[PDB]
Amino acid sequence: SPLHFVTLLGSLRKASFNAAVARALPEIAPEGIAITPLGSIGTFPHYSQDVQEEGFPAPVLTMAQQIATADAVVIVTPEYNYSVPGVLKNAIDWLSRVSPQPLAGKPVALVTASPGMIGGARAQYHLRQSLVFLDAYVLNRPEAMIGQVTGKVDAQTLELSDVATREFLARQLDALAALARTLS
Template sequence: MSKDGPITFAVMLGSLRKASFNGIVARALPGLAPADVTIQPLASVGALPIYDADIQAEGFPAEVTAMADAVRAADGVIIISPEYNYSIPGGLKNAIDWLSRLPNQPFAGKPIAIQTASMSPLGGVRCQYHLRQSMVFLDARILNKPEVIIGAVHTKVDAATDTLTDETTRGIIKAQLENFAAYARRHHG
């Protein structure tokens, strides 16, 4: 089923650091999105307790159900993350683990776009690989291209003004958002 009209994307940020380069990228998205796309940040993944089946047995924490509801309500989710130790940062993985355990699992059938940024030249490619594995297991609909992998991100942002300054990177993100909007409309359901 296809969707016409405005759409909304939720942004799940994998970094907790206040001055995060990935946070700068995330905050740049509304200005790079097509006119009919609204981009809203999800609550911080750091707001969720560490996943524990004993806590789950007592009932899902309100922070988990609120994030799940926001994911379900969005037409798609953009995951933006650094790479930690060749993989997914712990807070982001924890949020995915919590959301994956809910009934009416919120990632199932949900269009997902991934963006990573790192100070390394590789830009978080291993994090992207691992996120894609998790999302395949959760039956999400992952946008494959164009990929947003931002290497040497510290040279492409101005941390003092909280601005993504590199025009090539801005263009790649804009292209991904345009493609993701079309993808989300095709896979709306």
């Protein structure tokens, strides 16, 4: 049983640490699980009910269908102002108005990375609150808060090289895989 996971990325900057983390998920995945990245949340317009009425942005239905046809989603994001980046919450707001709504019943795992010690934990719980409304099924264990990320991805090379973080994340994908196969 080959699973397909897609990753949703909360940062827009080229040198993003969270992006480096996301890029590593596919090389980290345990055999039997392919992982690809979704489109950029940066292509979405700001959510407006007027825009919705005129019609859903193509990039939003694209992301909706890729999530819906995926076996699980891994959300990978920094924490902004003790919460979720507004850009990322904005992508969530759009996906939440689609019918059928793509996150409903969808296995979901969260990963946050910060240069600081909290490792973006404040973000994960606000994001959970929204996901309750969307009826996603978010993995409780293990939680992935990557503090001091600056020390875990080597500079100029962009890559996540920290061995223990790769182990941790690889095991989180396994649990996500097990969660998905159990709601199947």
